[PDB]
Nucleic acid binder design. Structure first.
Ligand SMILES: [Mg+2]
Ligand SMILES: [Mg+2]
Ligand SMILES: [Mg+2]
Lengths: 1208, 501
RNA sequence: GUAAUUUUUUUUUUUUUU
RNA sequence: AAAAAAAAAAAAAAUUACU
């Protein structure tokens, strides 16, 4: 009757009775809130105050539950906590609180006359408490708390843990919940007004703290230290106190690692291989031990004194490097609440986007060639930091200038507009001219360009944009400020397109720009893993504090001098509305005017650099229109990241030439830069490496940047990835399973499960217990997302219910709301979670009819069509090949509920919904709009690539339109026209069409089978022979290289068997990723690769037309052909499966690494594709069954029908 | 084929001094291009304002080498129509597309013509001082050819082989067109009309030309007059067309004045200036502020006070105006006061020229620590010695911009703009681009240029001429032209073009 | 556990003053 | 018929995530 007393809680297996029991107990928690209130606040939970247990490293710790008085008895709302200026035009200049202050919920009353300043301030302060706090990822917040508490109960088989008393001592105020969230009003309603204003967020803090316990990061006694620390910050203002101690509670680990003294660590080769292990010293240099003094004093007075004694204990009780790594993982969970930090955008404005002026002022360069209006066409630096940066950068201006000449910049701008982002707002006079449907789609950059295509070559288009304001728009992020961003219109975004195109070319001439976290696996940290394995090396992960605001108007000129140099050496006619022509010009030394030939790239860059207005504007409900001060880099632009990257690498690499011309050597080996992230690695003498690092920091101060120097001997950070002595420390708190930033819970069904699957995958190699991460996600899919609510027409309400009730349980609502249709929830079976095209979640052992169980599927278990095998696996494949039958045992699959689960998948509800939405898109308007965009770039090569697609489709091969480059313009205008929400007339057509398919499918539903399913009929037998471990198993037994890869664990053993990444495969992936613009991460599952590889194997002689259809130039044709040639060594088309790079972070991508572990009889090789096929069968089985792998060799058996399907 | 049809907009070309020859192979060609314009505009209107194949259009018109004939039919219906028209011309080549090098001319080109320029090689006619050269091939054959009458040239139209059908008259005699027309027999000739002036002065380095937006009668100046006489009219309406530094100074005299074409204001200027007039007029904006940067010695205070009255009279509201020395003169008095006053009427009373600035006191004692006391000692230094002193003056400026303290620059402008009794409209002047982060939160900052050699107005003055020249060089080194450049005649033109109520 | 909310217009009745 | 206040019915415009 209780979740911790179930038999699934003691066996962790799915029998026909354990499964039906957990199914009914979890559906009871998802439907009604009386059961949830009963589950969370039952009187059987005895409150505990004193606790004692082991810390994260096995030492004894004692804690006491402490809830401050300011949370139980909050104060009255003080109106002086949010002051205003004497003009009342904005908030006060220096105001203490940018976030929600802790006060009594009912203490905030709005007793002012409407349309008044103090009325607006209170109508907005009300939205801060009731609207900016409801941020849930999957479901209601009380449902998400039930999911965390259910898993903590089923895992520990008890209820006496400290997190239960926190839940009861915080939210149990009466016989109902203190507050709820109404999805209709999009608001949080308070039932108890005598409650703290900040409590709705602490429901997420409990979710996050319980998530770290399931993860192995925190223990039960450490959950007290963590919850006591969070409640201590909420005494005055939660978010303001957390941001103020975020770094001080984390930067202690470098001192704790120094005191360890020695460490045995793995050693990395240059080619991404662990080649040995060594014992080194972890003592820091003398200039690092000097910062231990100032940091000791800051912790002693700013930190919660119970939290400080945990750090002092972590710092004295650590004996190995694995000790510091475990204590450090806990202090991230103690200082990161897990939520996304949100407030009023007027309150975070001055702290996020206001310009700031650091050490030194940056001076101008000498103008050499000027305009008729005295606007610099060409300049040069006399001295300073501009002279130092250009000494390195001016040596790329000739090679870049010729790469720019070989680009069609008008077609490049049309591909840059792959964004459906707003820009501005249409005008009614303008709106009337286009008419109807078109204006409904104008929230996109590609559609605003199509409407105004008549004036693309008109120069007045530019000047009209200097009259429009830059709309400010902000985003959220965990553990940081709000950081408003600028949204430019298509015209101001155009003036930044040539400075972007120019500075992007230098990425091809250096190796000091980080590609990013493109690969998604350990290939991103491959350089750090190597350089942190060397000796006599100094590691510098230096950070520019608020670079976006620190860039002043004269600092931007250092990049202008670079762009204007390139533009003057190129020959570009007809860029936008510009053309090359003779121009009257002023020169230095000469007294009258000259005449020069200025090309189009020079005219665009020269106009942009001399008309710079960076101030953004936010329209506030309180103050009207609010404008920023001038100077902050807009950061919504084409060249916002290439500017920071080019400016920083010219200062670091130019200081290398400055020191050489002064008689000083450089100890600098590599630098990696991405935006404002810098990573410097010096190797050499101790005083030589310190000398070079100090002058590098001093040249950054001379450029008006403030920065803190965190130098280390044995740790380095880049892009939120910490590497310490050849070991990766993951940041598990940076991933919120329970909160999200966008107020659009995309993924109404079967796509939220893809979002949860993608979030669990990111957590595996940054967590200490991935098996507790599986129990968590299982209960999230069983409680948070198990209902599917849609509105059904009343004339079909009883027909859909009576027909669907035979497979699944449905919920209905009020009979008559006095409307046409009423809404109807749908409760899907638990078996839906583990099914393909459904939940696709790792399963627990199901019980077969003969009494044996299936495999306990791990976190490395593949998805896709591979999940279909579980249907035959519970049907005893082993017994199935003995009888030579291919049958499903439909009776047993019905008891668990797979028949009802697979039926719901066959309705294809989401696909069905999008068909009624595209019926309202008029293709006459999409084609007319696409016709006018084609007159802007290249005059052709859309029809040509479209015809190549159709002349391809006439044969066996038919590409999807998103792949074809000729439909690139349409596919966006479809997205632009489909971005609209569903209307009420469309909900009827959905209900009508959904009703037709239910009476069509539910007649006699049997689980269907294809002939290709014979490939699933294979098994394995355990021999008595122990396979040998790879030699890098000894090298990883000291100081494991991930939190989930400790010695003896399942992630450690999978490395000792399969090995590490395939260096040759990841290299060919980084190439095919750099061929696609506006493309973050490429995987071998991508449509262009999968569709192109399918023809490369079937009909290679048609591969040229494929290249014309996708518009692959000779460079990308070689990059794709080179990857098709390698993937064919191990790839397969017939047996599809899906692994993620974040999932196999350190593990091998190539299935062939598993053929040394399995023995296959040579009589089974009956076809040319058998070898690659059998390598997959064993590669997927060893990753799925890794929890019971004791290191024995396997023998493969095959169904006689599998052999028949392969022969032909 | 001109980019703007001269048969329709004949008054536009008359502004440049271009009068159509009366009504030949050239008479036939200007009629043909007028038919192509009407056809192109009719075709563009039928697909959302765009031509469907701008490359086929450009090749048929400008090269004359393409024929489209029906023997799909709906996609080439417009190109078949343009084809039979151009066949009927029977030209030996194609019509070249002609453009001027004027910003005003380029702003009036139709949209469909701009779509052709990407697929043609246009013939761009240059302009010297806003006037296209009449010696061009196409300008000589299509329009009348001007004949400039001067004082050493005044004679009957018979002394030269002038015909009223081929020549227009540019009267530069200084006398009325009515006396010239009747006392010398030019009754049948067409005179060109210029509304501006073009003055030539004597400079320190040579001779300086200046274009003024006033008539030679309105501007009361003749040959030999002084630069200081009628100075405010030159400053409000004049733009010097030389490279900076020009040699203009208070010792310049006029060598020559002539009627000239009147200048057009820039488009990027009128856009940023009308972006400021939106905030003045709107009710969704509480405080409006225009920041104006200029070089030290440009004469921006004398102008921006008149600009502020003309804005107050047109908008009907009160306009405040802080000088560029407002903060330094306040800081000189209240640097030791613990709780100084930030009232607008108190700050406004310190903004007089008799109050010394804080930055002038520090640069005075700085120039003494190096031994500089006169302008002649300063001009003798090398560039590296000067730059080494400006770096020490940059340390005095950074200390007032780095934080937001009681006496900081950011707090000063905050407590002044957000005051209860401060005007709603403010015009603040600045010195260098780093004050972007301190002066009021705005969306419109401009850089003002005048007719002034700023280094010459600083060394030809009194009241500490060496500190004034030193600070001019220090600020110049911190103020590039990275914000939109405006002129006094453009800032006054924006007020007139705005529709008040 | 739904389909509401801002401001503006028109006609429809209610009550108050001339 | 001059106005004010509320009730019903219909129309108008209207919340927003840059690179
Ligand atoms: Mg960093
Ligand atoms: Mg930064
Ligand atoms: Mg950063």
């Amino acid at each position: 009757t209780e979740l911790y007393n179930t038999i699934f809680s003691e066996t962790r297996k799915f029998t026909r009775e354990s499964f039906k029991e957990i199914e009914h107990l979890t559906a009871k928690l998802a439907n009604d809130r009386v059961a949830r209130h009963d589950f969370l606040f039952n009187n059987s939970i005895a409150l505990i105050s004193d606790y004692s247990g082991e810390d994260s490293n096995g030492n004894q710790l004692q804690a006491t539950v402490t809830i401050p008085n300011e949370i139980t008895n909050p104060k009255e709302y003080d109106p002086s906590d949010y002051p205003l200026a004497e003009d009342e035009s904005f908030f006060k200049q220096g105001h203490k609180y940018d976030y929600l202050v802790t006060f009594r919920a009912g203490s905030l009353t709005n007793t002012y006359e409407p349309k008044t300043k103090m009325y607006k301030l209170h109508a907005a302060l009300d939205k801060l408490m009731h609207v900016k706090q409801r941020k849930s990822r999957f479901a209601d917040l009380w449902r998400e708390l039930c999911a965390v508490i259910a898993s903590l109960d089923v895992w520990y088989q008890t209820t006496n843990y400290p997190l239960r008393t926190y839940v009861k001592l915080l939210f149990h105020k009466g016989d109902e919940f203190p507050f709820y969230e109404s999805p209709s009003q999009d608001k949080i309603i308070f039932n108890d007004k005598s409650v703290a204003s900040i409590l709705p967020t602490f429901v997420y803090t409990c979710c996050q703290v319980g998530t770290a316990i399931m993860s192995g990061i925190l223990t039960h006694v450490e959950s007290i230290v963590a919850m006591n620390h969070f409640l201590h910050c909420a005494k005055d203002s939660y978010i303001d106190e957390k941001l103020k101690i975020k770094g001080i509670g984390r930067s202690w680990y470098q001192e704790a690692l120094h005191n360890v003294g020695r460490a045995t660590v793995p050693v990395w080769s240059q080619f991404n291989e662990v080649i040995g292990h060594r014992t080194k010293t972890t003592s820091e240099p003398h200039f690092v031990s000097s910062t231990f003094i100032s940091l000791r004093a800051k912790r002693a007075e700013l930190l919660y004194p119970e939290f400080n004694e945990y750090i002092n204990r972590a710092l004295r009780l650590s004996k190995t490097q694995n000790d510091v790594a475990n204590y450090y993982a806990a202090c991230r969970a103690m200082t990161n609440d897990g939520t996304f930090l949100a407030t009023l955008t007027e309150l975070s404005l001055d702290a996020a986007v206001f310009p700031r002026i650091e050490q030194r002022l940056v001076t101008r360069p000498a103008v050499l060639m000027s305009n008729t209006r005295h606007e610099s066409l060409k300049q040069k630096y006399a001295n300073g930091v501009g002279s130092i940066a250009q000494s390195y950068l001016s040596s790329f201006t000739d090679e870049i200038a010729k790469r720019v000449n070989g680009i069609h910049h008008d077609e490049a701008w049309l591909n840059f507009l792959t964004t459906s982002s707003p820009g501005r707002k249409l005008t009614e006079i303008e709106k009337l001219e286009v008419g109807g449907d078109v204006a409904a789609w104008s929230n996109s950059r590609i559609v605003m360009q199509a409407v105004f295509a008549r004036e693309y070559r008109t120069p007045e288009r530019i000047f009209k944009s200097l009259k429009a304001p830059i709309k400010l728009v902000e985003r959220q992020q965990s553990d940081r400020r709000q950081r408003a961003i600028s949204g430019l219109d298509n015209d101001r975004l155009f003036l930044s397109f040539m400075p972007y195109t120019i500075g992007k070319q230098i990425y091809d001439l250096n190796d000091n720009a980080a590609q990013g976290k493109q690969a998604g696996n350990a290939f991103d940290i491959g350089e750090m893993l190597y350089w942190t394995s060397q000796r006599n090396v100094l590691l510098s992960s230096i950070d520019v504090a608020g670079m976006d605001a620190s860039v002043t108007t004269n600092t931007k000129d250092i990049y202008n001098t670079f762009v204007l140099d390139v533009a003057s050496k190129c020959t570009v006619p007809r860029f936008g509305p510009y053309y090359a022509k003779n121009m009257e010009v002023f020169e230095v030394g000469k007294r009258q005017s000259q005449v020069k030939y200025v090309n189009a790239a020079w005219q665009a860059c020269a106009l942009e650099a001399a008309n710079s207005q960076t101030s953004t504007s936010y329209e506030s409900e309180i103050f009207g229109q609010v404008k920023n001060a001038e100077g902050t880099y807009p950061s919504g632009r084409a060249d916002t990241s290439t500017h920071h990257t080019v400016l920083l690498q010219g200062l670091v690499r130019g200081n290398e030439l400055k020191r050489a011309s002064d008689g000083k050597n450089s100890c600098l080996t590599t630098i990696k830069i991405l935006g404002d992230d810098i990573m410097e690695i010096f190797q050499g003498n101790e005083n030589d490496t310190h000398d070079h690092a100090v002058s590098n920091a001093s040249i950054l101060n001379e450029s008006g940047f403030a920065t803190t120097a965190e130098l280390s001997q044995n740790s380095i950070v880049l892009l939120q990835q910490l590497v310490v002595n050849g070991t990766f420390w993951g940041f598990a708190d940076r991933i919120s399973l329970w909160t999200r930033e966008d107020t659009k819970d995309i993924g109404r069904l079967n796509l939220a499960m893809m979002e949860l699957n993608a979030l669990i995958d990111d957590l595996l190699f940054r967590v200490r217990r991935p098996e507790g991460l599986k129990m968590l996600g299982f209960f999230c899919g069983a409680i948070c997302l198990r209902r599917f609510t849609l509105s059904v027409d009343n004339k079909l309400y009883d027909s859909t219910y009576n027909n669907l009730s035979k497979y699944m349980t449905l919920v209905k609502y009020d009979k008559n709301p006095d409307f046409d249709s009423t809404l109807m929830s749908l409760i899907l079976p638990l078996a839906w979670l583990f099914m393909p095209r459904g939940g696709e979640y790792p399963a627990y052992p199901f019980e077969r009819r003969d009494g044996t169980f299936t495999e306990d599927e791990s976190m490395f278990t593949a998805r896709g069509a591979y999940k279909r095998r579980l249907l035959y696996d519970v049907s005893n494949i082993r017994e199935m090949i003995q009888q030579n039958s291919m049958v499903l045992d439909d009776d047993l699959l019905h008891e668990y509920g797979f028949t009802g689960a697979l039926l719901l998948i066959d309705l294809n509800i989401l696909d069905l919904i999008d068909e009624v939405k595209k019926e309202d898109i008029s293709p006459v308007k999409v084609n007319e709009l696409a016709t006018s965009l084609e007159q802007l770039g290249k005059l052709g090569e859309r029809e040509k690539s479209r015809r190549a697609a159709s002349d391809l489709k006439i044969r066996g091969h038919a590409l999807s339109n998103d792949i074809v480059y000729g439909y690139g313009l349409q596919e966006k205008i479809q997205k632009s026209a489909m971005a609209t929400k569903e209307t009420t007339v469309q909900s009827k057509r959905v209900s009508s069409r959904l009703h037709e398919v239910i009476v069509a499918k539910t007649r006699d539903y049997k689980i269907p089978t294809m002939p290709a399913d014979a490939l699933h009929l294979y098994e394995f037998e355990v021999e008595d022979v122990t396979v040998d471990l790879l030699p890098h198993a000894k090298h990883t037994s000291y100081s494991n290289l991930a939190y989930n890869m400790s010695f003896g664990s399942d992630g450690w053993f999978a490395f000792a068997l399969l090995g590490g990444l395939d260096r040759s495969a990841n290299l060919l992936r980084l190439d095919v990723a750099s061929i696609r613009g506006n493309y973050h991460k490429f995987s071998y599952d991508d449509p262009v690769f999968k569709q192109g590889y399918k023809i490369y194997k079937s009909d290679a002689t048609l591969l040229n037309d494929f290249f014309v259809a996708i518009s692959a130039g000779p460079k990308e044709q070689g990059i794709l052909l080179r990857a098709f040639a390698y993937y064919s060594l191990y790839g397969n088309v017939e047996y599809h499966y899906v692994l993620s790079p974040r999932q196999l972070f350190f593990l091998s991508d190539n299935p062939v690494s598993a053929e040394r572990l399995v023995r296959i009889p040579p009589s089974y090789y009956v076809s040319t594709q058998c070898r690659a096929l059998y390598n997959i069968f064993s590669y997927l089985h060893i990753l799925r069954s890794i929890t019971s792998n004791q290191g024995k060799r396997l023998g493969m058996v095959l169904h006689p029908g599998l052999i028949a399907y392969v022969r032909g | 084929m001109f980019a703007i049809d001269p048969l329709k907009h004949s008054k536009l070309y008359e502004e440049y001094g271009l009068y159509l020859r009366p009504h030949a192979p050239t008479i036939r060609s200007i009629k043909y291009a007028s038919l192509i314009h009407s056809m192109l505009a009719k075709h563009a209107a039928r697909h959302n304002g765009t031509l469907i194949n701008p490359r086929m259009y450009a090749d048929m018109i400008t090269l004359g080498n393409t024929k489209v004939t029906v023997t799909d039919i709906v996609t080439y219906k417009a190109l078949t129509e343009m084809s039979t028209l151009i066949e009927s011309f029977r030209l030996p080549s194609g019509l070249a597309l002609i453009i001027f090098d004027d910003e005003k001319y380029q702003s009036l080109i139709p949209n469909y013509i701009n779509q052709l320029i990407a697929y043609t090689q246009p013939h761009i006619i240059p302009t010297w001082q806003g006037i296209a050269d009449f010696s061009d091939t196409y300008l000589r054959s299509y329009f009348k050819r001007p004949f400039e009458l001067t004082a050493s040239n005044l004679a009957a139209p018979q002394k030269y082989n002038l015909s009223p059908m081929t020549r227009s008259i540019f009267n530069n005699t200084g006398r009325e067109d009515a006396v010239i027309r009747k006392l010398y027999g030019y009754g049948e000739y067409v005179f060109i009309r210029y509304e501006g002036c073009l003055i030539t002065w004597t400079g320190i380095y040579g001779e300086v030309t200046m274009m003024v937006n006033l008539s030679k009668r309105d501007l009361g100046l003749d040959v030999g007059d002084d630069y200081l006489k009628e100075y405010k009219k030159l400053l409000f309406y004049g733009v010097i067309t030389d490279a900076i530094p020009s040699g203009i100074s208070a010792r310049s005299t006029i060598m020559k004045i002539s009627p000239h074409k009147m200048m057009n204001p820039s488009g990027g200027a009128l856009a940023v200036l009308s972006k400021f007039l939106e905030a003045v007029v709107s009710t969704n904006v509480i405080n409006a502020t225009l920041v104006v940067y200029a070089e030290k010695g440009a004469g921006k205070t004398s102008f921006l006070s008149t600009y502020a009255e003309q804005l107050s009279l047109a908008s009907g509201q009160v306009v405040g105006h802080l000088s560029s020395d407002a903060y330094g003169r306040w800081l000189a008095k209240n640097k030791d006061v613990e709780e100084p006053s930030f009232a607008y009427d108190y700050v406004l009373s310190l903004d007089t020229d008799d109050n010394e600035s804080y930055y002038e006191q520090k640069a005075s004692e700085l120039l003494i620590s190096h031994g500089i006391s006169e302008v002649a000692q300063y001009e003798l230094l090398s560039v590296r010695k000067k730059i080494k002193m400006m770096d020490e003056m940059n340390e005095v400026l950074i200390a007032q911009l780095e934080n937001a303290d009681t006496h900081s620059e950011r707090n000063f402008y905050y407590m002044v703009s957000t005051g209860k009794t401060t005007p709603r409209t403010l015009i603040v002047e600045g010195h260098f681009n780093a004050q972007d982060a301190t002066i009021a939160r705005t969306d419109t900052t401009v850089l003002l240029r005048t007719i002034n050699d700023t280094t010459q107005a600083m060394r030809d003055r009194q009241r500490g001429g060496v500190v004034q020249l030193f600070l001019r060089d220090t600020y110049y080194r911190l103020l590039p032209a990275l914000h939109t450049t405006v002129y006094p005649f453009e800032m006054l033109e924006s007020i007139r073009r705005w529709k008040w109520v």
